[PDB]
Amino acid sequence: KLVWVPSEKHGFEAASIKEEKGDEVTVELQENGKKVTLSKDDIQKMNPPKFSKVEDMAELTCLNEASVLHNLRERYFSGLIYTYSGLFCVVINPYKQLPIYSEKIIDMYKGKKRHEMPPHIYAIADTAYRSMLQDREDQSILCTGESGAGKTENTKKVIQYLAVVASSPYGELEKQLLQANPILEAFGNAKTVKNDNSSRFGKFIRINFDVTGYIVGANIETYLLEKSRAIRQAKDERTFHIFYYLIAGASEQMRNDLLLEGFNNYTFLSNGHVPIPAQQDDEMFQETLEAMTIMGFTEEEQTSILRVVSSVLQLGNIVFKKERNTDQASMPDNTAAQKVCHLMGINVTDFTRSILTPRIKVGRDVVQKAQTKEQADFAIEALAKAKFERLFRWILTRVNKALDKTKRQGASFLGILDIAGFEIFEINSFEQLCINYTNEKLQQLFNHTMFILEQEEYQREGIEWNFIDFGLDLQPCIELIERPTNPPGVLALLDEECWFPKATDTSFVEKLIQEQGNHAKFQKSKDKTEFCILHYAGKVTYNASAWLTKNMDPLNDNVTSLLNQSSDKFVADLWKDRTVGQLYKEQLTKLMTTLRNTNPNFVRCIIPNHEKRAGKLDAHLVLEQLRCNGVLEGIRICRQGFPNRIVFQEFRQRYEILAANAIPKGFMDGKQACILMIKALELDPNLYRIGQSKIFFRTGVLAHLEEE
Numbered sequence: 001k002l003v004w005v006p007s008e009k010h011g012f013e014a015a016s017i018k019e020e021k022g023d024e025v026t027v028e029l030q031e032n033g034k035k036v037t038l039s040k041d042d043i044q045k046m047n048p049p050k051f052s053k054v055e056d057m058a059e060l061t062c063l064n065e066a067s068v069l070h071n072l073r074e075r076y077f078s079g080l081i082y083t084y085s086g087l088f089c090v091v092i093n094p095y096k097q098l099p100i101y102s103e104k105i106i107d108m109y110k111g112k113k114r115h116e117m118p119p120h121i122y123a124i125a126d127t128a129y130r131s132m133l134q135d136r137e138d139q140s141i142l143c144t145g146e147s148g149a150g151k152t153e154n155t156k157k158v159i160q161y162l163a164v165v166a167s168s169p170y171g172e173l174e175k176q177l178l179q180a181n182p183i184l185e186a187f188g189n190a191k192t193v194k195n196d197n198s199s200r201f202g203k204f205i206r207i208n209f210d211v212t213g214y215i216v217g218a219n220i221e222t223y224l225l226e227k228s229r230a231i232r233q234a235k236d237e238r239t240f241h242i243f244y245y246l247i248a249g250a251s252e253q254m255r256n257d258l259l260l261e262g263f264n265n266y267t268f269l270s271n272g273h274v275p276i277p278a279q280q281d282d283e284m285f286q287e288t289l290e291a292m293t294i295m296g297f298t299e300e301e302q303t304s305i306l307r308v309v310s311s312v313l314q315l316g317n318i319v320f321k322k323e324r325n326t327d328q329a330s331m332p333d334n335t336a337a338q339k340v341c342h343l344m345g346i347n348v349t350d351f352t353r354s355i356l357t358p359r360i361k362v363g364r365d366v367v368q369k370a371q372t373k374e375q376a377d378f379a380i381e382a383l384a385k386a387k388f389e390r391l392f393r394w395i396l397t398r399v400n401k402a403l404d405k406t407k408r409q410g411a412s413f414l415g416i417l418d419i420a421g422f423e424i425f426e427i428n429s430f431e432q433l434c435i436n437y438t439n440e441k442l443q444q445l446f447n448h449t450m451f452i453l454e455q456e457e458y459q460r461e462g463i464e465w466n467f468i469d470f471g472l473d474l475q476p477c478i479e480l481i482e483r484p485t486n487p488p489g490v491l492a493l494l495d496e497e498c499w500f501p502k503a504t505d506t507s508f509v510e511k512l513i514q515e516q517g518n519h520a521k522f523q524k525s526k527d528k529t530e531f532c533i534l535h536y537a538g539k540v541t542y543n544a545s546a547w548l549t550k551n552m553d554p555l556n557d558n559v560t561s562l563l564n565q566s567s568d569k570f571v572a573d574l575w576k577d578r579t580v581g582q583l584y585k586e587q588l589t590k591l592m593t594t595l596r597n598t599n600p601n602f603v604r605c606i607i608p609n610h611e612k613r614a615g616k617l618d619a620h621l622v623l624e625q626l627r628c629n630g631v632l633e634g635i636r637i638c639r640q641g642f643p644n645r646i647v648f649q650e651f652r653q654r655y656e657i658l659a660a661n662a663i664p665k666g667f668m669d670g671k672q673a674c675i676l677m678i679k680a681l682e683l684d685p686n687l688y689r690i691g692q693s694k695i696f697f698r699t700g701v702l703a704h705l706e707e708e
């Protein structure tokens, strides 16, 4: 007499039905004994105890939100962070070190089928690896989820599994491969209120393989680096790890060399020295230097990199005042300009002139215009973000150079996506639009993949599949963001608005209301810069402040030129060289085109709590992520159809006891044997469907069968 009822504290909770009266049901909570009257439709059927901590939730007889949630909860507290959810995988961040990632465990998963061993990331990495050789098709592992859910941690475990199994211990390439993320994270990761090691970029790591299956090379593409983090940070947050590593670690000689001057003497360090618990910045600096040594970065490359990190900071120490009774920019103190110019290998007078009085061509004449304090601050800020992303791109292209040095492309690859998941913030700027546009494509991919896997399964069994593409639901929303013309999208109207002379951020929004106002996935807010978009996971209020500027990404042409002709060979290489929106759409088209031609493996990461705590599972927050992931839409769709499918030999062996009379003494066909057991059970012909190898059942039909 036990059931699942909705719970404000636990999401769902065990309770027993004491009295029924039509739709009204009076339950008694199996925790505190408190009486609760609620509707029959809020009540959720509970699974037999033989399903306690079930490794694959597709095995559940009663498929419901309450049963799935409890299955993940039971596993999580038993130390079990991995759970298979039929066609995809779920990972709940333990926030503690688990002993599941040793050399013994790697060897145990070598060539094992998904069902042959307990759930692990190693098994996803192995099944995709074996399939790549067997089927001769490219693979992908998609580690999705919120900030601090476990995307980076899992992505790296796939790398360390494959660097062991697909090795030619480890070997120069595999040793270097394991150093890519230590380097990239030093420059692209930061301490955030959500994650002490948040990825402030997204990546798709492509590992290349020999016909035999040996790692032959690798390439990494990065997306959306938060270059604005170099300038200023929110309360209790840090810039990229590298500034703290360098300042904390650098030798007495290095400090003097690169003109480094402590945590409190830099404006680009908004909160001074903020520490990362259980981590020392000086230790991490040595750990980063070591990784760059393994990757083959010469001491000169290492030192020129730290010299750029130092100049990025100095830029954010230059102070502009105003000439008396004018808006005109003045630099009364040359101290910072001199220090940064010594580092950038450029002339200080030529730099000062390039920031305060830049020469601009008008045709045919050239206007030397004096800048306002505001324009010069924007120019120095714009240049510091631009230098930093150009330093990340250089470090990245050098890592790729080290990792594809063999001039070998292989017969196949295994792509590993680790990009930022959907998150609604207080301010959702142009970057959030791009991140949320990306997830509209990654969720359409997942939805459509499940739709193909099922369409193919239903066809094999010869059972009727009356469903339209599950990916098509996310299509109008995408068309509101991309779509070049007929109704032009959000980005298309931005690109067009950036060309208008008098154009403003409000101007852009007014034009957006005028063009997309009555679009299904559009809503007017309630501020003249604000607008809403109804994404798969939820309504997001976007603020269009400085988007026109963000899409244009302007830099002072004069200083970029000086840097292009720097006396320092490295700085010169950085500045060796149309919209931000158009360029990102290209990156996403190219990534989606890649992913669409690989067999995808989904690894849905779940954050247990917003506290960064071990053994604390926030039920309603885990529920909120399964909704967002598509898990709850999945539970619904499979409830609608046939969730339980059993093979004839397994149906007979499992339920021989009940229909004892139906099976006559002798040899008989599997399909034939079951028909008679089904007929003896007097099962409704709407509840079942006989397939070519498995019997398809509606939800709770097999639960009824579960009796002794």
Ligand SMILES: CN(C(=O)NCc1cccc(F)c1Cl)[C@H](COC(=O)Nc1cc2ccccc2cn1)C[C@@H](O)CO
Pocket: 057, 058, 063, 068, 085, 086, 087, 088, 447, 450, 451, 454, 470, 630, 631, 632, 633, 634, 635, 637, 638, 642, 643, 644, 645
């Ligand atoms: C019946 N089924 C299950 O795995 N049921 C458990 C389950 C489904 C969904 C969310 C869940 F939590 C859970 Cl436990 C297997 C194939 O069915 C799927 O997996 N479809 C599916 C469709 C979706 C459609 C839209 C959005 C998400 C979706 C997710 N998924 C087939 C199995 O017999 C063999 O693996």
Ligand SMILES: Nc1ncnc2c1ncn2[C@@H]1O[C@H](COP(=O)(O)OP(=O)(O)O)[C@@H](O)[C@H]1O
Pocket: 081, 093, 094, 095, 096, 097, 098, 145, 146, 147, 148, 149, 150, 151, 152, 153, 154, 195, 196, 197, 198, 199, 605
């Ligand atoms: N499987 C795991 N085992 C141990 N710690 C983990 C695991 N997954 C995540 N963590 C913890 O969570 C933190 C955030 O993980 P991270 O992968 O960087 O998140 P994100 O999904 O934002 O990339 C890590 O610093 C670590 O403490």
Ligand code: BEF
Pocket: 146, 147, 148, 149, 151, 152, 195, 197, 198, 199, 200, 419, 420, 421
């Ligand atoms: F913090 Be996650 F890596 F976006």
Ligand SMILES: [Mg+2]
Pocket: 151, 152, 153, 198, 199, 418
């Ligand atoms: Mg990450």
